[PDB]
RNA sequence: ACCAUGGUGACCACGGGUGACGGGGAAUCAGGGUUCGAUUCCGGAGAGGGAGCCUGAGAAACGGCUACCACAUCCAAGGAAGGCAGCAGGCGCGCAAAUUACCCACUCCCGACCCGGGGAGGUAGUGACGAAAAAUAACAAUACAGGACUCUUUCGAGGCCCUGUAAUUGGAAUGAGUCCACUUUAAAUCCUUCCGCGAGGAUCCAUUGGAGGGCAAGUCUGGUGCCAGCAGCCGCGGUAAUUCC
């Protein structure tokens, strides 16, 4: 069993702090290797340049090609793959644009049937993606 | 083939564009709540059918 | 630095679980039976009704004749007797617990000018209060959520600058006195 | 004139300042906010002086009209009205002249004098001919 | 300087890391708690990085000096002058943050001082960080649909209330906006006050997400057929898709 007496607050408080290192969502927030590992560096958005259109293939019961890009970031530059989260919007992004990639929804884990993409593209070339999809804004001339 | 990387935007580019037509504008704010309080609550429906919802057909 | 104020708090609170069908239908018929604009101003007075019940029920767990039970409790009870929601003869720390949300909306300016016969059709009361007609004793007010006390409850009337109490008719009767006499006699 | 009625309250005289200070409320039903020189000429027939030592200011009309309220006062002399008085209210009707250069000009003037020493003949003519 | 051999530590010393200035406090809300606190208040620290000083009651001062290191300016090439983590502004870094405005009138401070000075500070502009109020229409006469009130009755239709069609109108209704004058204020601008204009698709135009389940709301029609795509999770799409366009 556990310790219960009016004198064991050293044993109890030291047994709680080292057993906190055994769930993930404390340890990824307090050990510091996990924030020196994510390419955002502890942020919610990051601009980056587009290297390659690449189409990953969907997971086990589905069958479609998910349209993705191969963004390299401008802050502490690193390679990521990012999803283009709309219908025709692979056509609006071209080679070596700059895009503001966001998180993809469930904290560094791939959502849906896309195998191993962690990010989605919004705001290609300083106009929005929803503005391009709805005909609000366009590419520069 | 199985849609490899081209024909992105396939179904949107070839759908027919039926135009968004126009009617008189909807009521906003306080008046919007008036026109739907009366629709749901003050109008007791004399007909039955297991009380189907508002967007029926 | 600055002589700025820095003090502000939220007046309402958003409901905990959304979209449960029993809540928002029974709370919709508060919006239409008292004629309000949105549900933020029902969540307003529900939070007002909350903090009064929270305070008073906290005063029941105190032992009897405790000094701040007497002071804060009687200060609470005189505050919601003068506002007209709690009738004075039954003043206890327990009859405040049966006080409901239907009773705080009844003491508003927007429905104490409907029932008195100054206007019809509860929505029209906003169309007369907010549209600058109806005063308290010497003060015109375009605020529907003005919580009228029982003291100044006999003094709701139209204003003197107003159409309904005075004159200099508005721009549509001035339009009608112009549209015949504008090209002829 | 017709219905512009002048009450006051919180009257207080003091011979620390040789003034009579009070709080004014002006009730007018359906007019605009009455001007300051139209009201200080009415306190001259309330406290029986001439409209030269009455200084009224700070009027703030309530929501809806009717009773505006401001602050006003009366001195014992026009020469007392020059001594213990802030210069701006002494100039809201013209008795003091503050028309100077800007403080952008005056600060650049002060730092230009600061770089020149001794030469009284050139500590004063430090860039006035460039006009 | 001369002696003694001590001091601390598993009740965590010593060393390391810190996305560590500390606190009052903030978010949370059954109790116990957990997280944040660069940020206006108090205390500390530092003015590019180290060091040494002068003056003075008080400084190891930096809108003081001396030197070295780092960056950088003028030059007639002999020499000079540097320090915005003060107010604005610029470049750069970035997911990421305001005008090179007006004034000492207020709150106070300094001085030889009722009088001068103060980018302290106050006022404006930028401001969907956020918080509080609060428009985008309400009454009508038809009118078409509902109601314990009408006949001695499921006769026949209503003289009576509530609603939406669809209206035709209207009138001591009014604002946003426009514009005089006051007022405001150091000077103004706002706000409040007030003449004059200013509403029939009040076209003077409410949106943002949704409509399989969780989770309020359609198996309506058209198009595409495991494609395009949607989908936080389960899932939907392979020729009639309640989920795609």
Curated annotation (Swiss-Prot), chain A:
Residue numbers of N6-acetyllysine PTMs: 134
Coiled-coil features, chain-numbered ranges: none
PROSITE patterns assigned to the protein according to its UniProt record, in alphabetical order: RIBOSOMAL_S12
UniProt-listed InterPro entries: NA-bd_OB-fold, Ribosomal_uS12, Ribosomal_uS12_euk/arc
Pfam families: Ribosom_S12_S23
Oligomeric and partner information: Component of the 40S small ribosomal subunit. Part of the small subunit (SSU) processome, composed of more than 70 proteins and the RNA chaperone small nucleolar RNA (snoRNA) U3.
Known disease link: Brachycephaly, trichomegaly, and developmental delay: An autosomal dominant developmental disorder characterized by brachycephaly, ciliary trichomegaly, dysmorphic features of the face and hands, hearing loss, and developmental delay with short stature. Intellectual disability and autism spectrum disorder may be present in some patients.
Listed name of the protein: Small ribosomal subunit protein uS12
Gene source species: Homo sapiens
Source lineage: Eukaryota, Metazoa, Chordata, Craniata, Vertebrata
Originating gene: RPS23
Swiss-Prot record, chain C:
Disulphide bridges: none
Residue span(s) of domain S4 RNA-binding: 107-181
Residues with N6-acetyllysine modification: 65, 115, 154
Ranges for region Disordered: 161-185
Keywords (A to Z) from UniProt: Acetylation, Cytoplasm, Isopeptide bond, Nucleus, Phosphoprotein, Ribonucleoprotein, Ribosomal protein, RNA-binding, rRNA-binding, Ubl conjugation
Matching SMART domains: Ribosomal_S4, S4
GO cellular component assignments: cytoplasm; cytosol; cytosolic ribosome; cytosolic small ribosomal subunit; extracellular exosome; focal adhesion; membrane; nucleolus
Gene Ontology molecular function, alphabetical: RNA binding; rRNA binding; structural constituent of ribosome; translation regulator activity
Keyword Coiled coil among record annotations: no
Protein name as catalogued: Small ribosomal subunit protein uS4
Gene responsible for this protein: RPS9
From Swiss-Prot, chain D:
Location of this chain's protein in the cell: Cytoplasm; Nucleus, Nucleolus
InterPro entries, A to Z: eRP_eS24_sf, Ribosomal_eS24, Ribosomal_eS24_CS, Ribosomal_uL23/eL15/eS24_sf
Biased composition, class Basic residues, residue ranges: 100-118
Modification Phosphothreonine, positions: 8
Superkingdom classification of source: Eukaryota
Keyword Hydrolase attached: no
Gene3D superfamilies hit by this protein: 3.30.70.3370
Listed transmembrane segments: none
PROSITE patterns the UniProt entry points to: RIBOSOMAL_S24E
Disordered: annotated segments: 91-131
Known tissue expression: Mature tissues, such as adult brain, skeletal muscle, heart, and kidney, express low levels, whereas tissues and organs with significant populations of proliferating cells, such as fetal brain, placenta, bone marrow, and various glandular organs, contain significantly higher levels.
Annotated family: Belongs to the eukaryotic ribosomal protein eS24 family.
Record PANTHER family: 40S RIBOSOMAL PROTEIN S24 (PTHR10496)
Protein name (record): Small ribosomal subunit protein eS24
Species of origin: Homo sapiens
């Amino acid at each position: 069993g556990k310790c219960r007496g009016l004198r064991t607050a050293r044993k109890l408080r030291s047994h709680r702090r080292d057993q906190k290192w055994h769930d993930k969502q404390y340890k990824k927030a307090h050990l510091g290797t996990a924030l020196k590992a994510n390419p955002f560096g502890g942020a919610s958005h990051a601009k980056g340049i587009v290297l390659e259109k690449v189409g990953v293939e969907a997971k086990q019961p589905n069958s479609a090609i998910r349209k993705c890009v191969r963004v390299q970031l401008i802050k502490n530059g690193k390679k990521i793959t990012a999803f283009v989260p709309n219908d025709g919007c692979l056509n609006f992004i071209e080679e070596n644009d700059e895009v503001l990639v966001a998180g993809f929804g469930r904290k560094g884990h791939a959502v849906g049937d896309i195998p191993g993409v962690r990010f989605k593209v919004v705001k290609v070339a300083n106009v929005s993606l929803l503005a391009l999809y709805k005909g609000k804004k366009e590419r520069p001339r | 083939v199985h849609g490899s990387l081209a024909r992105a935007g396939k179904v949107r580019g070839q759908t027919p564009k039926v135009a968004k037509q126009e009617k008189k504008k909807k009521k906003t704010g306080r008046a919007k709540r008036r026109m739907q309080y009366n629709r749901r609550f003050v109008n007791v429906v004399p007909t039955f059918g297991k009380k189907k919802g508002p967007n029926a057909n | 630095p600055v002589a700025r104020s820095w003090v502000c708090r939220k007046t309402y609170v958003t409901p905990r679980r959304p979209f449960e069908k029993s809540r928002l239908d029974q709370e919709l018929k508060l919006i239409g039976e008292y004629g309000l604009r949105n549900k933020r101003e029902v969540w307003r007075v529900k939070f007002t009704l909350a903090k009064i019940r929270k305070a008073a029920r906290e005063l029941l767990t105190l032992d009897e004749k405790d000094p701040r039970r007497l002071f804060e409790g009687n200060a609470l009870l005189r505050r919601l007797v003068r506002i007209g929601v709690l009738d004075e003869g039954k003043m206890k720390l327990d009859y405040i617990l049966g006080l409901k949300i239907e009773d705080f909306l009844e003491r508003r300016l927007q429905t104490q000018v409907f029932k008195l016969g100054l206007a019809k059709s509860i929505h029209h009361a906003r169309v007369l209060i907010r549209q600058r007609h109806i005063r308290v004793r010497k003060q015109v007010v375009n605020i529907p959520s003005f919580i009228v006390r029982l003291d100044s409850q006999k003094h709701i009337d139209f204003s003197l600058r107003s159409p309904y109490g005075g004159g200099r008719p508005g721009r549509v009767k001035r339009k009608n006195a112009k549209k015949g006499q504008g090209g002829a006699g | 004139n017709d219905t512009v009625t002048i009450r006051t309250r919180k009257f207080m005289t003091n011979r620390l300042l040789q003034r009579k200070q009070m709080v004014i409320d002006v009730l007018h039903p359906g007019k605009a906010t009455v001007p300051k020189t139209e009201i200080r000429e009415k306190l001259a027939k309330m406290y029986k002086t001439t409209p030269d030592v009455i200084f009224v200011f700070g009027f703030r009309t309530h929501f809806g009209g009717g009773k505006t309220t401001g602050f006003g006062m009366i001195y014992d002399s026009l020469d007392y009205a020059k001594k213990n008085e802030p210069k701006h209210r002494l100039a809201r009707h013209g008795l003091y002249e503050k028309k100077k250069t800007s403080r952008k000009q005056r600060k650049e003037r002060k730092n230009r004098m600061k770089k020149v020493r001794g030469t009284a003949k050139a500590n004063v003519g430090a860039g006035k001919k460039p006009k």
